[PDB]
Amino acid sequence: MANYTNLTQGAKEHEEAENIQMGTFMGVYLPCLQNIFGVILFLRLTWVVGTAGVLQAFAIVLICCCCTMLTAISMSAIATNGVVPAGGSYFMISRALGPEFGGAVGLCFYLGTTFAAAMYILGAIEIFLVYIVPSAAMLNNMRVYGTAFLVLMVLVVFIGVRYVNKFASLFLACVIVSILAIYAGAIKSSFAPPHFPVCMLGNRTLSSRHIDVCSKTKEINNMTVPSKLWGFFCNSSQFFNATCDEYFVHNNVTSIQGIPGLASGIITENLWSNYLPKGEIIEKPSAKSSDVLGSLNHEYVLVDITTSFTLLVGIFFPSVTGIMAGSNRSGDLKDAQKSIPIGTILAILTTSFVYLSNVVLFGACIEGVVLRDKFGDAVKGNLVVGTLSWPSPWVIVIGSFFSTCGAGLQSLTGAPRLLQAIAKDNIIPFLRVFGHSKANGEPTWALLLTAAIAELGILIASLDLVAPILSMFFLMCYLFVNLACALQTLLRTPNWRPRFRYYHWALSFMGMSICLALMFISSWYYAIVAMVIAGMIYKYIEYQGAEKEWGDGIRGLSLSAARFALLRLEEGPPHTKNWRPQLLVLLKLDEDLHVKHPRLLTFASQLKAGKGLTIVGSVIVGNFLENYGEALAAEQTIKHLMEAEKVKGFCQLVVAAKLREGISHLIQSCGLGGMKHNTVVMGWPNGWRQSEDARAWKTFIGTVRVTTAAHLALLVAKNISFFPSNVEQFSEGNIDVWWIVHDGGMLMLLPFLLKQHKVWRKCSIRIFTVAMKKDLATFLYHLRIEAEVEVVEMHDSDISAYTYERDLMMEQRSNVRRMHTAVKLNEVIVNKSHEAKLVLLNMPGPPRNPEGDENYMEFLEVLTEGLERVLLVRGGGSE
């Protein structure tokens, strides 16, 4: 009806979409299914069931399926977020997780795929050599035949990939026919199981590759001659005073049925682990046996490797790898964000059900001795799982070989395409050589490097030793795919909208943890190497990206970090659960371009205590075209002064035509979006009455208006010349906070930030509240904070100029009286706090009409008449 393929889509298929069909079954399901059903299912799954016991085999398959399923969930989250590129799964992963994670996952998955191309060649060779056409001799035969087969497959994928695309369907057909034959055999093995008997010597199993009858003597022409097995346990071969070894004279050779019925109940026997070390004779704990020993013979089927749990998990994991292949044919899709998750998860569920069912079927149909037999021995040299089939084990032994060579072709096509895709991106520079492609867009150098790595793999001519490396590389790939999603969900990474119905970051984190444990349990010494290689690739990609975009390596690296943090900072809830003063210190520069108030910087350092954001802003009156030299000079001066006063922050100078306009620009333009200030710290205009320039107090009140309108807090320090330094300290003193009717939050939060510094550390705090929603919060804060409270109530007229403005707020959401009341405020404040070390004090807002600015400044001046060091505070915002 229709032709399809299961291979990948590299840069060749991506450049088509950059220059400018199938559903879920044929688009995402069949590709993932044909790539998960590897060779292990046919060559090591029975052996794993045997040497692990159905219970532990089920646990191993479940853990592997658990990591791969959680990784499928994370990969579906990656697939749904944003547009799905036309390329393979690598392009999706890159565009979703950034170039760093994209390249790390790409290289780990590529090493995985190369060693998979090696394992599948080794498996096809093992099937061809051992089962179809017959110690270290076997390893060298596998080496030479696997090298020949790899040189053949490389030429095939190099010359004629189109035929591989055409025959992918035949390979899938072979896989499915083989699995259905396995199931049909398991079923037919209920009533009529097959006739595969095994010669077993007591409870020690014998081979059958050369024996014919499981009897100590055969009878040709009524002559009780000794069977051929006599020649393998007795160096007499005649029975004429035969000198047989220990174990043979005592015990019995028996024809044990090798495949009992599915309902026979043999499962009760092999429900437990064996884990016998190397060279141990395989023992069935069912038949009778003597106790004599010593007869170490050649026909005893021996455990071929020192099996263990952590070894079995690694040997089995490369049968669940391949889930990223689900979305390696994503360019030819109709609804990608719908077709990819469903297809991938359904494929993984299908394969997990097949594996978990076959574990139990092998448990309950194959004898507990034929399962631990890792080379199909003891059954006259036929495939273990092959014995469970409807027609004959031949269907399985041919289907497995064709499937495994097809998967080898698949992995020698997907690995170099992925390598040219990682090369053309210029993510990693030195791989640029592999960016070269053929005329039709097929990799050439990538294919050669993949051939080299696959040959390196093949030189270890044993599935049991290649499987851990393959599994570790795919495990690292899945670990990064599971960790990047968790990170981008937690840290609110931009453009991370995982439009999935079931993806919760806990799932990806759980997958990361599960098969991180899998990596380490398999082999921690391989796993640390893999983690360090992946981390080095990740950091090198990050460094190259920084050098590419910003122009410098480490400079640009910190630049990228800052820019990314600021971006991530924008797309969030602009409010904060707590308010913290992030200061803009307004330093006034005299006509000599020196800081007219260093105590401003000293007090800012004492307020912020070396932490937080401090923007020191200053305006230089003049024309910028002919002042930039003076600008750089004064900026260096202010930076040196900031360093001298232990202020950590940034300096901004604006060369402006008018001081008021310069400061009005500074108050609203300082800081990059996200790193905005929230308070403006000003010095009081000392001698405003004595400076006949009418613009001093005007400029001050203008700055106050601009701050209030911008909804920033304001901290006007007065008599700042008498503020302390950083080296000196106070023996004993009282920070008196005079919280007038409104704006309590700042007035109480500041003296604690101050007393938390070494200078003001040894002083006490006294809250002289004068004028009840806010009242409750003060008690809670003072409980948080264990300072001292005090209430001093007075007449309403004295605080009229305050309450008036306060009233103006509630409806929103004279001068002679102001002066006659400010003196009352003076009376109380001095009579209580005259000898304080720092008096915080709430402020009234500036008048609406700019005419009473002289009156407002006189109000302030008299309000502060007689106090040593005053911190006028104004809220302005929400807090």
Ligand X SMILES: *[C@@H]1O[C@H](CO)[C@@H](O)[C@H](O)[C@H]1NC(C)=O
Ligand Y SMILES: *[C@@H]1O[C@H](CO)[C@@H](O[C@@H]2O[C@H](CO)[C@@H](O[C@@H]3O[C@H](CO)[C@@H](O)[C@H](O)[C@@H]3O)[C@H](O)[C@H]2NC(C)=O)[C@H](O)[C@H]1NC(C)=O
Question: Taking the CB of residue 152, how many other CB atoms lie within 10 A of it?
Answer: 13
The nearer residue to its own copies, 225 or 675, going by C-beta atoms, is 675
Residue 842 labelled as part of a binding site: no
Give the nearest distance from C-beta 382 to ligand Y in angstroms.
24
Contacts (Cβ under 8 Å, ≥6 apart) of 66? 511, 514
Segment 691-750, which members bind ligand Y (CB under 6 A)? none
Give the nearest distance from C-beta 404 to ligand X in angstroms.
43
- Judged by CB under 6 A, the residue of 147, 165, 236, 252 near ligand X is 252
Q: Which does 694 bind (CB under 5 to 8 A by kind): ligand X, its own copies, ligand Y, none?
A: none
Does residue 251 belong to the site contacting ligand X (CB under 6 A)? yes
Give the nearest distance from C-beta 430 to its own copies in angstroms.
16
Between CA 816 and CA 582 the distance in angstroms is: 37
Give the nearest distance from C-beta 291 to ligand Y in angstroms.
4
Does residue 296 belong to the site contacting ligand Y (CB under 6 A)? no
In whole angstroms, how far apart are CA 517 and each of 348, 479, 508? 21, 10, 14
Q: What is the residue type of 74? A: S
The footprint of ligand X on this chain (CB under 6 A) covers a number of residues equal to 4
Q: Which two tokens stand for residue 438?
A: 């053929």
Q: Which does 552 bind (CB under 5 to 8 A by kind): its own copies, ligand X, ligand Y, none?
A: its own copies
Segment 263-302, which members bind ligand X (CB under 6 A)? 288, 290
Between CA 289 and CA 190 the distance in angstroms is: 29
Helices and strands of the chain, counted as H and E runs: 25, 15
Choose one: 281-289, 305-313, 398-406, 439-447; the region binding ligand Y (CB under 6 A). Answer: 281-289
Q: Which does 152 bind (CB under 5 to 8 A by kind): ligand Y, ligand X, its own copies, none?
A: none
CB of 801 within 8 A of CB of 844?
A: yes
Nearest Cα neighbor of 268 from 389, 187, 387, 367 is 367
Q: Quick one: three-class SS letters along 489-558? A: HHCCCCCCCCCCCCCCHHHHHHHHHHHHHHHHHHHHHHHHHHHHHHHHHHHHHHHHHHHHHCCCCHHHHH
Residue 739 labelled as part of a binding site: no
CB of 723 within 8 A of CB of 869?
A: yes
- Judged by CB under 8 A, the residue of 665, 698, 774, 782 near its own copies is 665
Does residue 808 belong to the site contacting its own copies (CB under 8 A)? no
Residue 222 labelled as part of a binding site: no
The nearer residue to ligand Y, 74 or 205, going by C-beta atoms, is 205
- Judged by CB under 6 A, the residue of 144, 151, 170, 293 near ligand Y is 293
Segment 545-564, which members bind its own copies (CB under 8 A)? 545, 547, 549-552, 554-556, 558-559, 561-563
Buried b (16+ CB within 10 A) or exposed e, 416-433: bbbbbbbbbbebbeebee
Choose one: 284-292, 506-514, 536-544, 725-733; the region binding ligand Y (CB under 6 A). Answer: 284-292
Between CA 394 and CA 402 the distance in angstroms is: 12
- Judged by CB under 6 A, the residue of 285, 391, 551, 610 near ligand Y is 285
The nearer residue to ligand X, 217 or 721, going by C-beta atoms, is 217
Residue 427 labelled as part of a binding site: yes
Between CA 213 and CA 760 the distance in angstroms is: 100
Q: Which does 288 bind (CB under 5 to 8 A by kind): its own copies, ligand X, ligand Y, none?
A: ligand X
The 193-212 contact track toward ligand Y, x by CB under 6 A, reads: ----------x---------
Give the nearest distance from C-beta 647 to its own copies in angstroms.
11
CB of 487 within 8 A of CB of 98?
A: no
Residue 271 labelled as part of a binding site: yes
Residue 688 labelled as part of a binding site: no
In whole angstroms, how far apart are CA 526 and each of 138, 312, 510, 517, 529? 27, 16, 22, 13, 5
Q: Which does 293 bind (CB under 5 to 8 A by kind): ligand X, its own copies, ligand Y, none?
A: ligand Y
Nearest Cα neighbor of 65 from 266, 454, 351, 325 is 351
- Judged by CB under 8 A, the residue of 190, 669, 725, 797 near its own copies is 669
- Judged by CB under 8 A, the residue of 293, 456, 536, 709 near its own copies is 709
The nearer residue to ligand Y, 214 or 546, going by C-beta atoms, is 214
The nearer residue to ligand Y, 126 or 283, going by C-beta atoms, is 283
Residue closest to ligand X when measured from CB atoms = 288
- Judged by CB under 8 A, the residue of 62, 249, 305, 567 near its own copies is 567
Give the nearest distance from C-beta 611 to its own copies in angstroms.
5
Question: Taking the CB of residue 719, how many other CB atoms lie within 10 A of it?
Answer: 15
Between CA 54 and CA 360 the distance in angstroms is: 6
| Beta strand 713-718 pairing with 870-874 | antiparallel
Residue 746, burial from CB neighbour count under 10 angstroms (0-12, 13-18, 19+): buried
Between CA 301 and CA 206 the distance in angstroms is: 6
Q: What is the residue type of 701? A: I
Binding site, annotated residues for chloride: 267-268, 271-272, 427
Binding site, annotated residues for K(+): 267-268, 270
> Which parts of this chain interact with ligand Y (CB under 6 A)?
203, 283, 285, 289, 291, 293
Binding site, annotated residues: 267-268, 270-272, 427
> Which parts of this chain interact with ligand X (CB under 6 A)?
251-252, 288, 290
